[PDB]
Design a protein around this ligand. Structure first.
Ligand code: WQG
Length: 165
């Protein structure tokens, strides 16, 4: 199971880790991807997870989009986890660098409540432009299921833990 996580609340745990390496090690039932509405896994967590699947995540995603159209900002879809997890829950947090409503971050985290346990990144953090401290607060106040957060950046991880209310 998950190891080396710091317990933040009854159900939220956090670790300074590369989510790709964490997924390859644990092989969780669900790994969360920081997706965009088109499931175009170019950079950030999405690009890293997709590269770990040898682009199989992108091929599967393009077929999903061709059939279903784009996701909504705040929405999600369950696809294969390939070599990383049983499933990948592609969740679209608002990208404030693309001018999207930051209030949609709570709706994005609500998708996590459909899964008993997840390995996840902080939604809308990193290249999505939101304040990661705000993302962690929305996560703890929205997610009721067991969420194991992987924060890649050590300096950000330390700031998140030291500022956690
Ligand atoms: O951008 C990232 N690349 C690789 N691993 C991560 C783990 C957690 C959060 C962000 C990342």
């Amino acid at each position: 199971s998950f190891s080396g996580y710091l317990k933040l609340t009854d159900n939220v745990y956090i670790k300074n880790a590369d989510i790709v390496e964490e997924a390859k090690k644990v092989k969780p039932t669900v790994v969360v991807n920081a997706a965009n509405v088109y499931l175009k896994h170019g950079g950030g967590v999405a690009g890293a997870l997709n590269k770990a699947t040898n682009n199989a995540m992108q091929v599967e995603s393009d077929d999903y989009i061709a059939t279903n159209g784009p996701l909504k900002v705040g929405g999600s879809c369950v696809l294969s986890g390939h070599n990383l997890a049983k499933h990948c829950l592609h969740v679209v947090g608002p990208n404030v660098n693309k001018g999207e409503d930051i209030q949609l971050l709570k709706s994005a985290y609500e998708n996590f409540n459909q899964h008993e346990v997840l390995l996840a990144p902080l939604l809308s953090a990193g290249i999505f432009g939101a304040d990661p401290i705000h993302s962690l607060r929305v996560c703890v106040d929205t997610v009721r299921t067991n969420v194991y957060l992987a924060v890649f950046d050590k300096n950000l991880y330390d700031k998140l833990v030291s500022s956690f209310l």
